[PDB]
């Protein structure tokens, strides 16, 4: 079975990408597992914002990496093959893995 | 007029022609017209009919 791991910083974008892959799957094959949301990675960073010295002066950024697990239970001939020509929107790292 | 348009050189002179070259007539006439107008010696010709 094909596990698919979508990763992105924008959550709307990743959602769009999840949808689109699901459609790609459903037309060709059958029994798409589903778009399961895994936990988001909130990597935080603190930095001093002064050029020279003001230590309590700080800014706290973060990057929210969003995960979407989509799974395909029955890999057919047509379905797996669709994805090659079906590239997704940019800023979305996908990761397919059969078995 | 459009028949006898070429010409052949006899003395190349101070220009850049040959002794048996067959160059067109108006070219050699403006060439020795601009050679002879100053203190030089031009290039003389002879006509052939085509």
């Amino acid at each position: 079975r094909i596990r698919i791991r979508l990763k992105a910083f924008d959550h709307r974008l990743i959602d769009q990408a999840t949808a689109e892959i699901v459609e790609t799957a459903k037309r060709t094959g059958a029994q798409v597992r589903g778009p399961i949301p895994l936990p988001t990675r909130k990597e935080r960073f603190t930095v001093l914002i002064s050029p020279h010295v003001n230590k309590d002066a700080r800014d706290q950024y973060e990057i929210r990496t969003h995960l979407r697990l989509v799974d395909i239970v029955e890999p057919t001939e047509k379905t797996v093959d669709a994805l090659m020509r079906l590239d997704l929107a940019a800023g979305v790292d996908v990761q397919i893995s059969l078995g | 007029r459009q028949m006898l348009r070429k010409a052949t050189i006899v003395n190349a002179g101070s220009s850049d022609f040959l002794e048996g070259e067959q160059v067109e007539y108006s070219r050699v006439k403006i060439a020795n017209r601009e050679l002879e107008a100053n203190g030089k010696v031009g290039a003389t010709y002879s006509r052939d009919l085509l």
Partner: protein, 161 residues
């Protein structure tokens, strides 16, 4: 009545060479084996390497050519000139046994070849036989944003579907 290289025709030696090897006539051509999956089937044929180039022993004058024309073995002599050129037999004399170049089976694949892996829909991309393991089936040598899987394909298919 000697060795002469002629541009000839193919595959049916033994009849024009019945005319010939009816005598002690001599014949030769470069050599090669061919493993070629013709139509879903690996076939092995050690056939002559060359096209119509072929060494034949015969004698020119008394036996005139137009009589013998009606057969194969006839494109024309090695010439480099108007006259039928007396050819050397370098292989026969000083180069008997060869073809260690390879058995490349000219342009037909061995394991690990880089060519088309899928047709129909998914093809528009030279995916790769990381191994023609057996001409049967797998899941492609495809590469997107995950692991590079190898062939997705059935017997007659992984190559030119």
């Amino acid at each position: 009545q000697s060795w002469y290289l002629l541009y000839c025709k193919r595959g049916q030696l033994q009849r024009a060479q019945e005319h010939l090897e009816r005598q002690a006539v001599n014949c030769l051509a470069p050599m090669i084996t061919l493993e070629k999956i013709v139509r879903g089937k690996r076939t092995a044929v050690s056939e002559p390497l060359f096209p119509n180039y072929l060494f034949v022993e015969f004698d020119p004058e008394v036996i005139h050519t137009t009589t013998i024309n009606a057969t194969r073995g006839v494109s024309h002599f090695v010439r480099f000139g108007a006259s039928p050129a007396i050819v050397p037999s370098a292989v026969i004399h000083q180069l008997s046994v060869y073809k260690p170049k390879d058995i490349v089976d000219p342009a037909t694949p061995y394991p690990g070849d880089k060519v088309i892996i899928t047709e129909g829909a998914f093809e528009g991309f030279q995916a790769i036989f990381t191994e023609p393991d057996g001409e049967a089936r797998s899941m492609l040598l495809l590469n997107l944003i995950n692991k590079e899987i190898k062939h997705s394909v059935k017997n007659t298919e992984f190559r030119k579907l």
